[PDB]
Specification:
4 copies of one chain form a homotetramer.
Chain A (H helix, E strand, L loop, with lengths): L8 E3 L2 E3 L8 E6 L9 E5 L4 E4 L4 H10 L3
Protein name (chain D): RANTES(4-68)
Organism (chain D): Homo sapiens
Chain lengths: ~70, ~70, ~60, ~60
C-alpha cells in the first residue's frame, strides 16, 4: 500500500544562487517527486539542508564528488 | 529579499490513520504554508516525523497536550 | 508492512489516474478504500472524505 | 551596509499577474539576479538565466 510512508519529506522552494563550500557538504539527496519543485538537497556538516537546482553544472559536479562513481 | 532561506521544508503527503501513542510524541510543528497540503508533524522519541491531519480532534488535542507539557 | 492501510492520502487523487478500487479487510484497524492507479500504485484513502465517496460511484455507476 | 543582493532564487515561477515591476541587483553583488516586485510589494529574487524570468521581463517592458 501507499503512501508507503506517513512520514514527512523534505521539499525545496528556492535554489541557492552560488555554490556553497564543497567542504561543508557531507551528503546529498534528490527531493521526493511528490514535492512541487525538482531539487537536490545538500546536507551540511551541521545538518542543514540546502536546496539547489538539479540542472546546474556545479550541483552535478558536487554530486559526482560525493558518489563513488 | 525573498526567498529568505535556501533551506528545505518538511512537507506532508499522507496523514496517519490512527492516533499515535501519546507517550511516543515529544514535539510537534505545523508544516510550512509553502507545502501543498496543510499538516501537523509529530516528532517521536525515535525522531520520526509523522504527518497528521490538522482537522482531526485527536491531533488538536495532542497539540494542546504537548503545549502544556 | 500489511494488507491494511496505515495512512490516508492528504489530497484527492486526480480522477483520471484511477483505474480501480477496493475496500481493505474489515479486520484492519483502519477502514479504507484503496485506489489502483494508472501507474499501478495502491493508494489508501479515507472512506469518509467526500471525494472518495464520489470517485467510487464514478467507478460503479454501470 | 544595507543588504541588496540575492542569495537564493525562487524555484517555482511567480504568478505573472502578481508582479508589477522588476529590477536587477547591482554588479557589486556576488550573484547576478532579477528581483520581481509583487502587488503586495514583496521583493523576490529570481534567476536571470531562466526562460520564465526573461519572458516576464520582456512582458513587463512592452507593458
Amino acid at each position: 500500500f501507499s503512501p508507503l510512508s506517513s512520514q514527512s519529506s523534505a521539499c525545496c522552494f528556492a535554489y541557492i544562487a552560488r555554490p556553497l563550500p564543497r567542504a561543508h557538504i557531507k551528503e546529498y539527496f534528490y527531493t521526493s517527486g511528490k514535492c512541487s519543485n525538482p531539487a537536490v538537497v545538500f546536507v551540511t556538516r551541521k545538518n542543514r539542508q540546502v536546496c539547489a537546482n538539479p540542472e546546474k553544472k556545479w550541483v552535478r559536479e558536487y554530486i559526482n564528488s560525493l558518489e563513488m562513481s
